[PDB]
Design a protein around this motif. Structure first.
Motif, PDB file in Angstrom:
ATOM      1  N   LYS A 242      -0.618  68.864  97.017  1.00 12.71           N
ATOM      2  CA  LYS A 242      -0.082  70.207  96.804  1.00 12.71           C
ATOM      3  C   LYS A 242      -0.431  71.033  98.034  1.00 12.71           C
ATOM      4  O   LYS A 242      -1.519  71.605  98.125  1.00 12.71           O
ATOM      5  CB  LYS A 242      -0.641  70.830  95.531  1.00 12.71           C
ATOM      6  N   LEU A 243       0.499  71.091  98.980  1.00 14.44           N
ATOM      7  CA  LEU A 243       0.256  71.791 100.228  1.00 14.44           C
ATOM      8  C   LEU A 243       0.117  73.288  99.978  1.00 14.44           C
ATOM      9  O   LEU A 243       0.618  73.832  98.991  1.00 14.44           O
ATOM     10  CB  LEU A 243       1.392  71.522 101.211  1.00 14.44           C
ATOM     11  N   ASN A 244      -0.578  73.958 100.895  1.00 13.91           N
ATOM     12  CA  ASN A 244      -0.878  75.374 100.731  1.00 13.91           C
ATOM     13  C   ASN A 244       0.300  76.243 101.151  1.00 13.91           C
ATOM     14  O   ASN A 244       0.142  77.165 101.957  1.00 13.91           O
ATOM     15  CB  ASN A 244      -2.122  75.748 101.538  1.00 13.91           C
ATOM     16  N   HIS A 245       1.487  75.959 100.606  1.00 13.54           N
ATOM     17  CA  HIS A 245       2.672  76.803 100.770  1.00 13.54           C
ATOM     18  C   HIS A 245       3.226  77.035  99.369  1.00 13.54           C
ATOM     19  O   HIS A 245       4.139  76.337  98.925  1.00 13.54           O
ATOM     20  CB  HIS A 245       3.703  76.155 101.692  1.00 13.54           C
ATOM     21  N   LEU A 246       2.676  78.027  98.678  1.00 14.27           N
ATOM     22  CA  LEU A 246       3.066  78.320  97.309  1.00 14.27           C
ATOM     23  C   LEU A 246       4.192  79.344  97.299  1.00 14.27           C
ATOM     24  O   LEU A 246       4.206  80.275  98.107  1.00 14.27           O
ATOM     25  CB  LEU A 246       1.870  78.833  96.507  1.00 14.27           C
ATOM     26  N   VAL A 247       5.134  79.165  96.372  1.00 15.51           N
ATOM     27  CA  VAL A 247       6.333  79.996  96.366  1.00 15.51           C
ATOM     28  C   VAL A 247       5.972  81.463  96.175  1.00 15.51           C
ATOM     29  O   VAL A 247       6.547  82.344  96.825  1.00 15.51           O
ATOM     30  CB  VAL A 247       7.316  79.509  95.286  1.00 15.51           C
TER      31      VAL A 247
ATOM     32  N   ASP B 227      12.893  70.908 101.706  1.00 15.19           N
ATOM     33  CA  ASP B 227      11.532  70.480 101.999  1.00 15.19           C
ATOM     34  C   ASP B 227      10.667  71.619 102.527  1.00 15.19           C
ATOM     35  O   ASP B 227       9.841  71.408 103.421  1.00 15.19           O
ATOM     36  CB  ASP B 227      11.547  69.318 102.991  1.00 15.19           C
ATOM     37  N   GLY B 228      10.843  72.824 101.992  1.00 15.96           N
ATOM     38  CA  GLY B 228      10.037  73.966 102.381  1.00 15.96           C
ATOM     39  C   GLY B 228      10.830  75.055 103.072  1.00 15.96           C
ATOM     40  O   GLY B 228      10.267  76.075 103.478  1.00 15.96           O
TER      41      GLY B 228
ATOM     42  N   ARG C 204      -0.802  77.374  88.724  1.00 17.24           N
ATOM     43  CA  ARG C 204      -0.688  76.068  88.075  1.00 17.24           C
ATOM     44  C   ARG C 204       0.299  75.171  88.815  1.00 17.24           C
ATOM     45  O   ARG C 204      -0.097  74.226  89.503  1.00 17.24           O
ATOM     46  CB  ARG C 204      -0.252  76.251  86.617  1.00 17.24           C
ATOM     47  N   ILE C 205       1.592  75.467  88.693  1.00 20.33           N
ATOM     48  CA  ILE C 205       2.645  74.811  89.459  1.00 20.33           C
ATOM     49  C   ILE C 205       3.942  75.528  89.111  1.00 20.33           C
ATOM     50  O   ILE C 205       4.062  76.105  88.025  1.00 20.33           O
ATOM     51  CB  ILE C 205       2.727  73.303  89.159  1.00 20.33           C
ATOM     52  N   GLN C 206       4.921  75.499  90.003  1.00 24.26           N
ATOM     53  CA  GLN C 206       6.218  76.090  89.705  1.00 24.26           C
ATOM     54  C   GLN C 206       7.221  75.607  90.744  1.00 24.26           C
ATOM     55  O   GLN C 206       6.827  75.127  91.809  1.00 24.26           O
ATOM     56  CB  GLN C 206       6.149  77.624  89.699  1.00 24.26           C
ATOM     57  N   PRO C 207       8.517  75.722  90.453  1.00 21.75           N
ATOM     58  CA  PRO C 207       9.532  75.396  91.463  1.00 21.75           C
ATOM     59  C   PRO C 207       9.338  76.232  92.718  1.00 21.75           C
ATOM     60  O   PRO C 207       9.048  77.428  92.651  1.00 21.75           O
ATOM     61  CB  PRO C 207      10.851  75.724  90.756  1.00 21.75           C
ATOM     62  N   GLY C 208       9.502  75.590  93.869  1.00 21.80           N
ATOM     63  CA  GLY C 208       9.277  76.210  95.160  1.00 21.80           C
ATOM     64  C   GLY C 208       7.935  75.882  95.776  1.00 21.80           C
ATOM     65  O   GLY C 208       7.749  76.098  96.982  1.00 21.80           O
ATOM     66  N   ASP C 209       6.987  75.375  94.992  1.00 18.84           N
ATOM     67  CA  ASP C 209       5.707  74.954  95.545  1.00 18.84           C
ATOM     68  C   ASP C 209       5.879  73.633  96.278  1.00 18.84           C
ATOM     69  O   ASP C 209       6.269  72.626  95.679  1.00 18.84           O
ATOM     70  CB  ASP C 209       4.668  74.813  94.434  1.00 18.84           C
ATOM     71  N   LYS C 210       5.587  73.632  97.575  1.00 22.95           N
ATOM     72  CA  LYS C 210       5.807  72.451  98.398  1.00 22.95           C
ATOM     73  C   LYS C 210       4.771  71.393  98.050  1.00 22.95           C
ATOM     74  O   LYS C 210       3.577  71.692  97.942  1.00 22.95           O
ATOM     75  CB  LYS C 210       5.744  72.808  99.881  1.00 22.95           C
ATOM     76  N   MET C 211       5.231  70.159  97.872  1.00 20.92           N
ATOM     77  CA  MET C 211       4.378  69.008  97.626  1.00 20.92           C
ATOM     78  C   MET C 211       4.776  67.897  98.581  1.00 20.92           C
ATOM     79  O   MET C 211       5.953  67.759  98.926  1.00 20.92           O
ATOM     80  CB  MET C 211       4.507  68.514  96.187  1.00 20.92           C
ATOM     81  N   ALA C 212       3.798  67.104  99.010  1.00 14.39           N
ATOM     82  CA  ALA C 212       4.076  66.026  99.942  1.00 14.39           C
ATOM     83  C   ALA C 212       3.095  64.889  99.715  1.00 14.39           C
ATOM     84  O   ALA C 212       2.013  65.076  99.156  1.00 14.39           O
ATOM     85  CB  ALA C 212       3.998  66.508 101.395  1.00 14.39           C
ATOM     86  N   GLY C 213       3.496  63.701 100.156  1.00 13.15           N
ATOM     87  CA  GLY C 213       2.634  62.546 100.189  1.00 13.15           C
ATOM     88  C   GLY C 213       1.881  62.451 101.499  1.00 13.15           C
ATOM     89  O   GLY C 213       1.761  63.422 102.253  1.00 13.15           O
TER      90      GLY C 213
END
Ligand SMILES: C[C@H](CCC(=O)NCCC[N+](C)(C)C[C@H](O)CS(=O)(=O)O)[C@H]1CC[C@H]2[C@@H]3[C@H](O)C[C@@H]4C[C@H](O)CC[C@]4(C)[C@H]3C[C@H](O)[C@]12C
Ligand SMILES: C[C@H](CCC(=O)NCCC[N+](C)(C)C[C@H](O)CS(=O)(=O)O)[C@H]1CC[C@H]2[C@@H]3[C@H](O)C[C@@H]4C[C@H](O)CC[C@]4(C)[C@H]3C[C@H](O)[C@]12C
Ligand SMILES: [Mg+2]
Lengths: 552, 1341
Positions: B1233-1238, A210-211, B1058-1067
């Motif tokens: 799409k939280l601002n923690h990009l891989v 989760d990050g 765009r998007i990629q594995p490691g990009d944090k996403m949350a509800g």
DNA sequence: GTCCGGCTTCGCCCGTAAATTCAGA
DNA sequence: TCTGAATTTACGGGCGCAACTATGCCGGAC
RNA sequence: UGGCAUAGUUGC
């Protein structure tokens, strides 16, 4: 060091040294001309204060502060403390050949390998790539090799694959609480920007996805590489160093898959038929002729090594299920069959791996763990085990337990107002009766939840352990325990303030129901306690473990 | 009714309770506080007027000359807000103060002065607050967070038994002033009252009493009651007050009127007290043993000797009684020192101290304050007078005096800023009363004891801190000045004011870089309450007292929206409806309940006022008339929720949302989420990045529109009207005649801010949401900024989610995303990045921006222009040269032999080196803007000239466009006016549109209106020309660059992640996850209809992390989309409006007792079509935070569509095609799409620059640094047998210069072996130890 | 623009040394 | 009037690890 | 071209 502009860095030692020379020169000049005793006395006092500030600023008192009113870091301040040399540059240092990145799952990996991105792989192994390029004659001068690497030509990637083959990389997660927080893996080049970390080792790392970020380090010398391969490989750390229990036990999805696979119901497709072996069971299940969980008879051949290291076969007809037979194909030879004839919760799987390690060895245990992970993931995917809102069934005994507890608190309060009891013991009695009511509600919930399903199409009703998703996950040990499922369905009970003080007012509503404004205000006390203990009272555990390490 | 804007898309509302008070302007606190700081106040209470009137007038040390004050004014800002952001200067207004200096001659106190000289002197610049509540200080938008400090006043605490190791609870009373010195009265285990000033050193309290000119006998009379012994004949007949006999044991036999009420030995009971009170017994006979232990009240003198026999505060004995017997003293006064109700605290304090006279007290206080210095009588007197009694050095503010009076049970709430003898006496007496047992200590965490400083108040404080220094300078100058030579300009120095003000707004703990990556982020950063900052707590000091949620936080502070980390509970966030009292205390609304009827009038109550009331809960059922239907309703009387009857209810909560803030009020089904997970959900909504397109949360809470509108990201129509023009970068609204002011015409122009960088390198872009000829009402959104759809906050995207394990790719918290999500580019984000290349005037010559870059071919320089700067729109990747600068600051010059050898080798290296700002490695994108800032007199280059010419042309074009738009509106108004009373239409087009001053009109007010319009035209033309001249002057002039920098080139790249594995996403319910795989579309689960699910989540995260709110949301989301599906089914194949409106009405009427009641019969069959078009992607649903939709309503809405009521459908495996047993939960959930990009986290280093003091790798990834092998990592390696790995880790890889160089060379050579060596940091430690008088050495083997 | 200099208190815990207070002779 | 033990008071050290972003970095005479 | 301070944030 020059700062942006003509101004130099406002160093601290320089200021202290430069206002000790000032006083020293002033005092020398005064003594040259034989100044009056009072003035030279005051100058001597100022010189003493300046030297004391230089050696250890603030120890005497009135810590002299420079611009921005920050006390200057004296020599004592530089060699001592958490920011001093000992604990900042000598016991722990920054290191080259190290990178960092977010971690992902990558279930396809084996226990001994980790997915390293191509970009970090190229950046970490630059000198090795230069050496290979020089050896193969593709770049005579190191400038040429560096230029080839920075362009990321199609040929340096082949070099990278050739040099990564048998070069372990340490993977480390930030709070290295115990020695399993840093483990060596064989890199597998990945097209991405995140490190793929094996699911099994996550429990050792305490690394959810989760990050979390993890750091890769590259052993350079032959001794370091062999130490990584022979001491720190994830396939050597099967058992935790603190106790004897395995540490690579499958965590939540694998255990759920195995629990679903090894289970039975009174009536399913293909029940009662006699199978000729586990292979027949898998064929039936894949063909759709029999359910994964249906009681059958299977001809199982198990190997017992009670002889002098000789595996002795033993064929019999076990009363089992299709899923249990299918799983038996993964167990190695020497293990008994009863080891997979149960529901296979998380503790059961842990004991299974432990027994395999003690009886067979290390390599069979590693292979068994990998196969367990694969099969558990596959059959958890097949099961389609989801969670809904109708799975948190509320007990019908909750309301009457609540009413009885409220009558008890009312009568205890009535006694208190009559003076029979004092405030402290009244509070204790209220707390205890509410705890008893909460336990009763949880027990009633679990009773209504576990035997919820009664299924029959061949005769009389027969109760069985429920297939409810919440219960199926709680019983299997995948995620959660009695407390959290209790809060979901049963009353969630008393809360505790950050100072370890219990709010005598309970919460009468679960999470499926409302939690009105007043109830969602008592809860925030407990939530603040939980988050404060995470961010404020972790310094105590860290301090204790540092003391334990530095004494031993 | 609906004003044509919310009628585009009516969000189905499930709220049961009726809204009573509209959500206040969320940015009210900041704007109001700053407005009451600069606004002219005739009363002088607030802001700069208060500061001036408090400081000015100023006189010299004598009555020689006087400088007084008239008024102040704020000059126009030098540059616009956008111009300030671009250039990098503060957005501030000049402060010009009209000061008049008067001169007093010989013996002219009140007579006419020699001369009065008045001038408008400039006193620094003051930063201005923009319309959104933010400050631009150095090109960056900053927010000054409000502070929550301890209110000034008097507070009594306990230090409950933690001292003395005996459990005794001491008592301390602190008098906190707004500006002054701290005064504390503390107790000790011996129960002696001591005092300490500024917590320097503890000295006896009575000393200060003597410092106030109090004699010992007067002190004893003041602090104690008096017992009278009368020597009438013998036995010392004592005057006894019966109520003083209770609480002790009768040491003698008490008798009066021949009635022994209490016998010898037995204690005094209540009945005895009643009998004595009713018997009217005044004097009694007493033995001699009783007086043996009493203390004489005041001093006595002997008539014979005329000297002292007993002084005040002396334990009377037989000897003293005998001595005073013959002196003639018959009435003897003593102190009534009861054991357990009236302690001898003052008596012991008087006895212990060595101070007896006032001067001794003053010198003692002086020595305590100034230790060691030779004390002086005048010095000590002045010091004590200036401590707590000078109006200039001590000031209990108005709130401070109010709290001081309230805590002492006084009557008035207004007093003097300074303390007084009565005030200190009352504080000491209250503390003694607390010690006795009557009264209670105050709780600091109470919100009635904690104020709310805002930006205005702190700005005023810092302005006064500058002004006091200015006063000191002016007073000093007034003594040594020839008065009749100089105006009040050189007298006043503006440097202190500017320094203080700019050092508070720029470098302060509360003036923080704004978190700007969401409307929610900004709007909740501005509504932030921080207990830290100057005058507040510190994260390393406060513990587990201000972190906890107090019962008074209800309705004034959100208990759940707080940051997790070192400062948890110190950075509280303001509640939705909370406001600030006049004194600075937080108050919340409440509906008044006079009779049993709940009245609809709102009273704002503070913590102390709310305490003594019973407030009914928000979720209390009421009928049409308004009556608590239930016999007993749940209320909260004194921070204690309970059940109260229908009549005692004094107030009711105005709304169910008032307990939370604007962050947690956006979480649907909050009540079903664990409070931790609500906290995390809010914190993560604050981090969501605005995607390419907004997506209108299907399951909201009704606070999205309020948040979007209140935050200054949209273009809210100032006045209603008709959209006259709308393009991608402008809106022009023709205002309605009803709302049109007289004269000026009068059409609103909104210039949308296109793609521009935010503080977090996100994209700020406003897109029009209205078309041509579309009516607009007042307050309606015209353009929506980042993360907004039709005026509704849309932080993320809602898409189809299924809850089940999937082959381990969602193992712990990972998310499995289909390739369809990335194909649709719905989570693709635009990040604008700023790269600045600065050419400076360094030694060895200046720096140049030429395109003649050595050591690089023409291919690399193709993308640059002739001036060496990249083109706009060029697609640059990592390593490309954006602005290639090469400086004559190159290398040294070669001596004859050296130079001959260099030339012999055949190389033409020059004295020019390569700096050449280039794109960071791994970062691509397109150049969207290049700005060249040139210092004065630098001969701007060709690219700078082109940029300036383009900017001048653009400025002229926009000015002319605005002018002719306004004038088209004006001419349209004139033509409309001419239609009556002599209308010309056939020949109106013959004459030009200009020559309309010669027309023929009758005599009325219409001709006057025409004249007013013509004058408006004339002044518009004149101000047009002047504004164009000003813009040309501002563009053509230079820039106030830093000292020593020649020019700056800022290039704005626009990368598209765009998007990629490691990009944090949350509800929205504290559910995280990093993408583990971008799955193929054909591999995803699909249902009976073949529609694949966009995302697969792990069910095991729902029970362990008790955020049930997601599942409910998911179910509701499914229902919502289901409704949309049917509308789409009714819309893609054209169907009659009747059936469509019937289905929409049935959908909107679905609920238990919802209070929305939208009627479609008044839509005219044309707004229904637009509503259907908006609802074809799922009907939006509003779920208030605590008044949300029950599960039964969710089931009903699911059944309204063709969806299963269980919320779980049947899915088939995309890979094998085989059905998944156990039907899975599928719905539509709102991913962020939280601002923690891989790609912002990935980092790697093999060799790089090393630190200076210790030759170790640098830290961080902004500098090419290495990872820290911490101490715990060293322990972990020691736990293994990894000795060689550790040795190379901390010697060859970190700080062995020879070791690491040799190891690198060996690796290149193909040999993997190391020479250990010794770390350089160890040598540094050795030298640092030797810098002391310590000789540490490495002795030989 | 270039060159030169010396007003904040408000945390919790524990170990250890100095000062005090008993408790006697 | 002295002298030892125990108690109290004053005061110095400690208060987890790792990581990322931003701004600001000295005030007074020639 | 590396240092300190303040503020914010992430994982435990
Ligand atoms: C007139 C107004 C109340 C009106 C009824 C009184 C009551 C409390 C007073 C303020 C507070 O003291 C805080 C602060 C103290 C500073 O020193 C000067 C500014 C502040 C804002 C004061 C100005 C004014 O005096 C206030 C607002
Ligand atoms: C609808 C309106 C009539 C009002 C009576 C007419 C009269 C004046 C016209 C605008 C400007 O003046 C010219 C400008 C031309 C550019 O190409 C972009 C369009 C601009 C803004 C025009 C749009 C529109 O056409 C206007 C507002
Ligand atoms: Mg984590």
């Amino acid at each position: 060091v020059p700062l942006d502009g003509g101004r130099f860095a406002t160093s601290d030692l320089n200021d202290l040294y430069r206002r000790v020379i000032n006083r020293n020169n002033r005092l020398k000049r005064l003594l040259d001309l034989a100044a009056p005793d009072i003035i030279v006395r005051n100058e001597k006092r100022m010189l003493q204060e300046a030297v004391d500030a230089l050696l250890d600023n603030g120890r005497r008192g009135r810590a002299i502060t420079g611009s921005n009113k920050r006390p200057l870091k004296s020599l004592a301040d530089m060699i001592k403390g958490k920011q001093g040399r000992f604990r900042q540059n000598l016991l722990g240092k920054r290191v080259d050949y190290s990178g960092r990145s977010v971690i992902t799952v990558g279930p396809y990996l084996r226990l001994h390998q980790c997915g390293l991105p191509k970009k970090m792989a190229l950046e970490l192994f630059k000198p090795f790539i230069y050496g290979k390029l020089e050896l193969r004659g593709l770049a005579t001068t190191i400038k040429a090799a560096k230029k080839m690497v920075e362009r990321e030509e199609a040929v340096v990637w082949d070099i990278l694959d050739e040099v990564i083959r048998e070069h372990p990389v340490l993977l480390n997660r930030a709070p290295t609480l115990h020695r399993l927080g840093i483990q060596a893996f064989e890199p597998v080049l990945i097209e991405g920007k995140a490190i793929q970390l094996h699911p099994l080792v996550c429990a050792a790392y305490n690394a959810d996805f989760d990050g979390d970020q993890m750091a890769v380090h590259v052993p350079l010398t032959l001794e370091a590489q062999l130490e990584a391969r022979a001491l720190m490989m994830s396939t050597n750390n099967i058992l935790s160093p603190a106790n004897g229990e395995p540490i690579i036990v499958p965590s939540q999805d694998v255990v759920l898959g195995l629990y679903y696979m090894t289970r039975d119901c009174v009536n399913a497709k293909g029940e009662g038929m006699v199978l000729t072996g586990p292979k027949e069971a898998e064929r039936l299940y894949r063909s759709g002729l029999a359910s994964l969980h249906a009681r059958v008879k299977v001809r199982i051949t198990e190997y017992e090594k009670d002889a002098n290291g000789e595996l002795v076969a033993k064929t019999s007809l076990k009363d089992t299920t299709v899923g249990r037979a299918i799983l038996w194909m993964i167990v190695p030879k020497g293990l008994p069959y009863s080891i997979v004839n149960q529901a296979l919760g998380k503790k059961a799987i842990s004991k299974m791996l432990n027994t395999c390690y003690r009886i067979l060895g290390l390599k069979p245990t590693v292979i068994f763990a990998d196969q367990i992970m694969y099969t558990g993931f596959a059959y958890a995917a097949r099961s389609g085990a989801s969670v809904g809102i109708d799975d948190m069934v509320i007990p019908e005994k909750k309301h009457e337990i609540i009413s009885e507890a409220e009558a008890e608190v009312a009568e205890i309060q009535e006694q208190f107002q009559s003076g029979l009891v004092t405030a402290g013991e009244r509070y204790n009695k209220v707390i205890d009766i509410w705890a008893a009511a909460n336990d009763r509600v949880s027990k009633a919930m679990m009773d209504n939840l576990q035997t919820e399903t009664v299924i029959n199409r061949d005769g009389q009703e027969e109760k069985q352990v429920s297939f409810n998703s919440i219960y199926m996950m709680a019983d299997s040990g995948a995620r959660g325990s009695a407390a959290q499922i209790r809060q979901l369905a049963g009353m969630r009970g008393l809360m505790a303030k950050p100072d370890g003080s219990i709010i005598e007012t309970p919460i009468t509503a679960n999470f499926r129901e409302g939690l009105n404004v007043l109830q969602y205000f008592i809860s925030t006390h407990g939530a603040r306690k939980g988050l404060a203990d995470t961010a404020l009272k972790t310094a105590n555990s860290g301090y204790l473990t540092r003391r334990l390490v530095d004494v031993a | 009714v609906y004003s044509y804007t919310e009628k585009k898309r009516i969000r189905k509302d499930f709220g049961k309770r009726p809204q009573v008070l509209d959500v206040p302007y969320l940015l009210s606190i900041q704007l109001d506080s700053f407005q009451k700081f600069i606004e002219q106040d005739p009363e002088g209470q607030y802001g700069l007027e208060a500061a001036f009137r408090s400081v000015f007038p100023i006189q010299s040390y004598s009555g020689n000359s006087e400088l007084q004050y008239v008024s102040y004014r704020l000059g126009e800002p030098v540059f616009d807000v956008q111009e300030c952001q671009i250039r990098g200067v503060t957005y501030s207004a000049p402060l010009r103060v009209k000061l008049r200096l008067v001169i007093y001659e010989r013996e002219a106190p009140e007579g006419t002065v020699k001369d009065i000289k008045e001038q408008e002197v400039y006193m620094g610049e003051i930063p201005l607050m923009t319309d959104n509540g933010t400050f631009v200080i150095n090109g960056t938008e900053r927010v000054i967070v409000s502070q929550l400090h301890r209110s000034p006043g008097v507070f009594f605490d306990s230090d409950k038994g933690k001292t003395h190791s005996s459990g005794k609870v001491l008592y301390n009373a602190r008098i906190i002033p707004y500006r002054g010195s701290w005064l504390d009265f503390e107790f000790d285990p011996k129960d002696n009252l001591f005092v300490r000033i500024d917590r320097r050193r503890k000295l006896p309290a009575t000393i200060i009493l003597r410092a106030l000119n109090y004699t010992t006998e007067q002190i004893l009379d003041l602090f104690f009651e008096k017992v009278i012994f009368e020597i009438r004949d013998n036995k010392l007949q004592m005057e006894l007050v019966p109520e003083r006999l209770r609480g002790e044991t009768a040491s003698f036999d008490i008798e009066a009127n021949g009635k022994v009420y209490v016998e010898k030995g037995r204690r005094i009971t209540a009945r005895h007290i009643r009998q004595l009170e009713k018997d009217d017994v005044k004097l009694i006979e007493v033995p001699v043993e009783y007086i043996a232990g009493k203390v004489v009240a005041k001093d006595y003198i002997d008539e014979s000797t005329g000297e002292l026999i007993c002084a005040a505060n002396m334990e009377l004995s037989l000897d003293l009684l005998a001595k005073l017997s013959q002196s003639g003293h018959k009435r003897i006064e003593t102190l009534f020192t009861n054991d357990l109700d009236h302690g001898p605290y003052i008596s012991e304090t008087l006895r212990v101290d060595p101070t007896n006279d006032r001067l001794s007290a003053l010198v003692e206080i002086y020595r305590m304050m100034r230790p060691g210095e030779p004390p002086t009588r005048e010095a000590a007197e002045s010091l004590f007078e200036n401590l707590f009694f000078s109006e200039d050095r001590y000031d209990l503010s108005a709130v401070g005096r109010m709290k001081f009076n309230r805590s002492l049970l006084r009557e008035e709430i207004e007093g003097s800023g300074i303390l007084s003898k009565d005030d200190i006496i009352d504080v000491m007496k209250k503390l003694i009363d607390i010690r006795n047992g009557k009264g209670e200590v105050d709780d600091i965490d109470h919100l009635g004891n904690r104020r709310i400083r805002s930006v205005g108040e702190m700005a005023e404080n810092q302005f006064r801190v500058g002004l006091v220094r200015v006063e000191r300078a002016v007073k000093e100058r007034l003594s040594l000045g020839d008065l009749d030579t100089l105006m009040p300009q050189d007298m006043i120095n503006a440097k202190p004011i500017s320094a203080a003000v700019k050092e508070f707004f720029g470098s302060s703990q509360l003036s923080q870089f704004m978190d700007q990556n969401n409307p929610l982020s900004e709007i909740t950063h501005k509504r932030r309450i921080s207990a830290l900052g100057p005058g507040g707590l510190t994260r390393e000091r406060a513990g587990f007292e201000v972190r906890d949620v107090h019962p008074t936080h209800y309705g004034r502070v959100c208990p759940i929206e707080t940051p997790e980390g070192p400062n948890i509970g110190l950075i509280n966030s303001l509640s939705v409806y909370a406001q600030t009292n006049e004194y600075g205390f937080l108050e919340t609304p409440y509906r008044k309940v006079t009779d049993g009827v709940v009245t609809d009038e709102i009273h704002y109550l503070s913590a102390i006022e709310e305490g003594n009331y019973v407030i009914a809960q928000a979720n209390s059922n009421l009928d049409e008339e308004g009556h608590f239907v239930e016999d007993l309703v749940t209320c909260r009387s004194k921070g204690e929720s309970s059940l109260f009857s229908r009549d005692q209810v004094d107030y009711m909560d105005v709304s169910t949302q008032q307990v939370v803030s604007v962050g947690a009020s956006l979480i649907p089904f909050l009540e079903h989420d664990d409070a931790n997970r609500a906290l995390m959900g809010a914190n993560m909504q604050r981090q969501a990045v605005p995607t390419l397109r907004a997506d209108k949360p299907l399951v909201g809470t009704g606070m999205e529109r309020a948040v979007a509108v209140d935050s200054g990201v949209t273009a809210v129509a100032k006045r209603g009207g008709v959209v006259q023009y709308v393009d991608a970068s402008r809106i022009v609204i023709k205002v309605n005649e009803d709302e049109m002011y007289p004269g000026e015409a009068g059409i609103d122009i909104y210039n949308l801010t296109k793609y521009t960088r935010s503080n977090q390198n996100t994209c700020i872009n406003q897109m029009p949401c209205v078309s041509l000829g579309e009516p607009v009402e007042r307050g309606d959104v015209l353009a929506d900024g980042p993360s907004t759809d039709l005026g509704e906050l849309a932080l993320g995207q809602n898409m189809r989610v299924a809850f089940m394990p999937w082959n381990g790719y969602n193992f712990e918290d990972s998310i499995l995303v289909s390739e369809r999500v990335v194909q649709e580019d719905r989570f693709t984000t635009i990040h604008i990045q700023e790269l600045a290349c600065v050419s400076r005037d360094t030694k060895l010559g200046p720096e140049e921006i030429t395109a003649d870059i050595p050591n690089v071919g023409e291919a690399a320089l193709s993308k640059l222009d002739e001036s060496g700067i990249v083109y706009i729109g060029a697609e640059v990747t990592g390593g490309d040269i954006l602005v290639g600068k090469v400086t004559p600051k190159g290398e040294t010059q070669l001596t004859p032999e050296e130079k001959l050898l260099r030339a012999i080798f055949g190389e033409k290296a020059s004295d020019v080196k390569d700096s050449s700002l280039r794109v960071p490695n791994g970062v691509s994108g397109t150049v969207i803007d290049v700005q060249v800032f040139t210092r004065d007199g630098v001969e701007k280059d060709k690219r700078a000239l082109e940029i300036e010419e383009m900017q001048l042309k653009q400025a002229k074009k926009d000015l002319s466009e605005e002018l002719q738009i306004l004038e088209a509106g004006l001419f349209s108004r004139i033509r409309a006016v001419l239609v009556a009373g002599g209308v010309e239409a056939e020949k109106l087009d013959k004459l030009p549109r200009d020559r309309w001053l010669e027309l023929g009109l009758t005599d009325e007010e219409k001709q006057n209106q025409l004249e007013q319009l013509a004058e408006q035209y004339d002044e518009l033309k004149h101000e047009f020309e002047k504004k164009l001249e000003a813009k040309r002057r501002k563009i053509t002039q230079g820039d106030d660059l830093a000292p020593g920098v020649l020019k700056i080139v800022k290039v704005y790249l626009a990368v598209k992640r765009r998007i990629q594995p490691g990009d944090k996403m949350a509800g929205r319910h504290g559910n995280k996850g990093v993408i583990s795989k971008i799955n193929p579309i054909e591999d995803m689960p699909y249902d009976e209809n073949g529609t694949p699910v966009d995302i697969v989540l792990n069910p095991l995260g729902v029970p362990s992390r008790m955020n049930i709110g997601q599942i409910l949301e998911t179910h509701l989301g499914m229902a919502a989309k289901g409704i949309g599906d049917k509308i789409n089914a009714m819309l893609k194949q054209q169907q009659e409006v009747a059936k469509l409106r019937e289905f929409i009405q049935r959908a909107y009427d679905l609920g238990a007792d919802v209070r929305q009641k939208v009627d479609l019969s008044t839509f005219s069959d044309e707004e229904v079509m637009r509503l259907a078009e908006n609802l074809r992607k799922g009907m939006p649903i509003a779920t208030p935070v605590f008044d949300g939709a029950k599960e039964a309503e969710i089931k009903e809405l699911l059944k309204l569509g063709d969806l299963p009521t269980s919320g779980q459908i049947r899915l088939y495996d995309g890979r094998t095609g085989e059905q998944f047993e156990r039907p899975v939960t599928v719905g539509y959930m709102y991913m962020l799409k939280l601002n923690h990009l891989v790609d912002d986290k990935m980092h790697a280093r093999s060799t790089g620059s090393y630190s200076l003091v210790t030759q170790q790798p640098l830290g961080g990834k902004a500098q090419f640094g290495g990872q820290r092998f911490g101490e715990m990592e060293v322990w972990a390696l020691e736990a293994y047998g990894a000795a060689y790995t550790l040795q190379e880790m901390l010697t060859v890889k970190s700080d062995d210069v020879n070791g690491r160089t040799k190891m690198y060379k060996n690796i290149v050579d193909g040999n993997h072996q190391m020479e250990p060596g010794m770390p350089e940091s160890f040598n540094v430690l050795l030298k640092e130890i030797r810098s002391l008088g310590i000789n540490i050495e490495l002795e030989d083997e």
